[PDB]
Design a protein around this ligand. Structure first.
Ligand SMILES: [Zn+2]
Ligand SMILES: [Zn+2]
Lengths: 107, 50
């Protein structure tokens, strides 16, 4: 990440001193000792998952005493939750029911 | 052997049929418009929702 000197406002570089790593200016004496953990997270875009779960994938989220689906009122349906973008997104819930003479997709 | 304006004039059997087709076809389009902007649209494989 860009961080800039309070004195002259040139761009800082990270270098190493005799006791700590420092943010340092190239044009003035200013240095800033890294005393504690500092971080910067990118969170890039993941792949699409839409065509990855279709067609009898290896899902696993089903559990004992799980709810029945609302149309058929039978537990013959899978349900899962996934991030669609990066993991800062709140996870979305989705479910699909597959029964005899009955095909549907629901949200 | 001749062509005239009466050879391309739509008879009453078509003008009723055409009105039904337009209303049915436009209303099916309007529902998918609503399903894109404000709901679920069954996204066909290999293409974006638009
Ligand atoms: Zn500076
Ligand atoms: Zn079913």
């Amino acid at each position: 990440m860009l961080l800039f000197c309070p004195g002259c406002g040139n761009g800082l570089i990270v270098e190493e001193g005799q006791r700590c790593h420092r943010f340092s200016c190239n044009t003035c004496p200013y240095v800033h000792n890294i005393t504690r953990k500092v971080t910067n997270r990118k969170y890039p875009k993941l792949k699409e998952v839409d065509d990855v779960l279709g067609g009898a994938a290896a899902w696993e989220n089903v559990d004992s005493t799980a709810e029945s689906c609302p149309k058929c009122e039978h537990p013959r349906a899978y349900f899962m939750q996934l991030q669609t973008r990066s993991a800062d997104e709140p996870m979305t819930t989705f479910y699909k029911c597959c029964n005899a003479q009955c095909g549907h997709r629901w949200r | 052997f001749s062509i005239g304006i009466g050879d391309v004039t739509p008879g009453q059997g078509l003008l009723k049929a055409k009105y039904e087709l337009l209303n049915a076809g436009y209303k099916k389009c309007d529902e998918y418009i609503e399903a894109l902007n404000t709901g679920k649209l069954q996204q066909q494989p290999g293409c974006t929702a638009e």
